[PDB]
From a paper:
pmcMHC class I molecules bind peptide antigens and present them to cytotoxic T lymphocytes (CTLs). We herein demonstrate that human leukocyte antigen (HLA)-A∗24:02 and HLA-C∗14:02 proteins, which are known to bind conventional long peptides, also have the potential to bind N-myristoylated short lipopeptides. These HLA class I molecules shared a serine at position 9 (Ser9) with Mamu-B∗098, in contrast to most MHC class I molecules that harbor a larger amino acid residue, such as tyrosine, at this position. Thus, we concluded that the structural flexibility of the large B pocket of HLA-A∗2402 and HLA-C∗1402 primarily accounted for their previously unrecognized capacity to bind such chemically distinct ligands as conventional peptides and N-myristoylated lipopeptides.
To gain structural insight into this dual binding potential, the crystal structure of HLA-A∗24:02 that was complexed with the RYGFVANF (RF8) peptide was also determined and compared with that of the lipopeptide-bound form. We also noted that the C-terminal Phe residue of the RF8 peptide was accommodated in the F pocket in a manner that was virtually identical to that for the C-terminal Phe residue of the Myr-GANF lipopeptide. The B pocket of HLA-A∗24:02 was able to accommodate either the long-chain fatty acid of the Myr-GANF lipopeptide or P2 amino acid residue (Tyr) of the RF8 peptide; therefore, we predicted that its pocket structure may be adaptively reorganizable in order to capture these chemically distinct anchors. In the peptide-bound complex, the hydrogen bond between Ser9 and His70 was maintained but modified in a way that supported a clockwise rotation of the χ2 dihedral angle of His70 at approximately 130 degrees. This rotary shift of the imidazole ring allowed exposure of its δ nitrogen atom (Nδ1), rather than Cδ2, to the B pocket surface, leading to the establishment of a hydrogen bond with the hydroxy group of the side chain of the P2 Tyr residue. Alternatively, HLA-A∗24:02 adopted a rather indirect strategy in which spatial shifts were induced not for Ser9 itself but for its hydrogen bond partner, His70. In contrast, rotation of the imidazole ring was induced upon peptide binding, resulting in exposure of the Nδ1 atom to the pocket surface to hydrogen bond with the P2 amino acid residue.
Author numbering:
A (entry chain B): 0 to 99
B (entry chain A): 0 to 276
C (entry chain C): 1 to 8
The structure:
């Protein structure tokens, strides 16, 4: 079996405007095999109401998933996505940057 | 759009000591998912995942349920057959993926058909473009290929791909017309991010586009910056549209050498963007 | 419209 490490993007659906409700996305792609754990974090803590898309895969057979939750960004709050996969020594935490 | 696809994707993963393999299948028209089946789910039914597929009546849901369940059972068998073919133990977990479906042009005619398997992420067997023979990747797959030749599987699949598949795709495009036929062009803009006194990042943005297919590239003095461009994978916004960006690191004062180029089916003509402070 | 598969 050949393994592939997840690519991770954390981003909002709409351009972030403090105080206005939005959606926070963590898109994980290019991984194999398919078992994976994904958490969205608010200031280091697990967000509860988090949905995700049905497992599918790309032309090279690697898998992708979208994790998402409604949220209202502010100046202070820090958001991140934490991903664990067999290819990772430890979970990878990717911080939300509103310009990426 | 100028052409359309219907694709089903399935993933079977064995769970040694934890019961039968997990089986997940999803159906797509272009980049829009419209059905799913998950062996973990209580319903044990094909379930809708787009509004327009709920136009289908009870016969559809019964028939599609029967078909995807037959597939799940055959792929559990196939995971077991692969263990024998590869002399692998019953202790290890393995994955079997299948993709099938068809492409049709905007005139409504068949363009291409697919029927292919991967085992543990590697190509196993695939129907070739002319739909008459098989690409089998290794020794094990030749055994399957011989069996599929004897049983005329390529003809069976050709008939499905040029018939039922095409007919299904056409119907879905009809029922989901208001959303499936859209070619929404990207909204584009550029941002500038100083890295230091010597360098800054230019990032070209494409937002709110459908379908997902897009080409976003940087040029410097009219030359492609293939090996210096950071290019993220096209990503879902969650509302039916997609996003992408491309960025280059540019020396200070050299921003006007750089242009961003956007090709998308919804664009009247390809775009060229320049940094405009 | 779903298709079908064969045994390995
Ligand atoms: Zn069209
Ligand atoms: Zn200096």
């Amino acid at each position: 079996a050949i393994q592939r490490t997840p690519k991770i993007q954390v981003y909002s659906r709409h351009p972030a405007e403090n105080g206005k409700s939005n959606f926070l996305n963590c898109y994980v792609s290019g991984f194999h095999p398919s078992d994976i754990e994904v958490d969205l974090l608010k200031n280091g803590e697990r967000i509860e109401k988090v949905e995700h898309s049905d497992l599918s895969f790309s032309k090279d057979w690697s898998f992708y998933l979208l994790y998402y939750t409604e949220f209202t960004p502010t100046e202070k709050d820090e958001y991140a996505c934490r991903v664990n996969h067999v290819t990772l020594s430890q979970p990878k935490i990717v911080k939300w940057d509103r310009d990426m | 759009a100028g052409s359309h696809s219907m694709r089903y994707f399935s993933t079977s993963v064995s769970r040694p000591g934890r019961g039968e393999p997990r089986f997940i299948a999803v159906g797509y028209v272009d980049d829009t998912q419209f059905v799913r089946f998950d062996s973990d789910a209580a319903s044990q039914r094909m379930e809708p995942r787009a509004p327009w597929i709920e136009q289908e009546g009870p016969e559809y849901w019964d028939e599609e349920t029967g078909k995807v369940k037959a597939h799940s059972q055959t792929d559990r068998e196939n995971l077991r057959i692969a263990l024998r073919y590869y002399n692998q133990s019953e202790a290890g977990s393995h994955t079997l993926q299948m993709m099938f479906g068809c492409d049709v042009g905007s005139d409504g005619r068949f363009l291409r058909g697919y029927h292919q398997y991967a085992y543990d992420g590697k190509d196993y067997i695939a129907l070739k473009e002319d739909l008459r023979s098989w690409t089998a990747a290794d020794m094990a797959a030749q055994i399957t290929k011989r069996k599929w030749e004897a049983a005329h599987v390529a003809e069976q699949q050709r008939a499905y791909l040029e018939g039922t598949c095409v007919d299904g795709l056409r119907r879905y495009l009809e029922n989901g017309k208001e959303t499936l036929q859209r070619t929404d062009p990207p909204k584009t803009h550029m941002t500038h991010h100083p890295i230091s006194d010597h360098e800054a990042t230019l990032r070209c943005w494409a937002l709110g586009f459908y379908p997902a297919e897009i080409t976003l590239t940087w040029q410097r003095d009219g030359e492609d910056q293939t090996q210096d461009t950071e290019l993220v994978e096209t990503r879902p916004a969650g509302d039916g549209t997609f996003q992408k960006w491309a960025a280059v690191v540019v020396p200070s004062g050299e921003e006007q050498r750089y242009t961003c180029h956007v090709q998308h089916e919804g664009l009247p003509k390809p775009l060229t963007l320049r940094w405009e402070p | 419209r779903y298709g079908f598969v064969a045994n390995f």
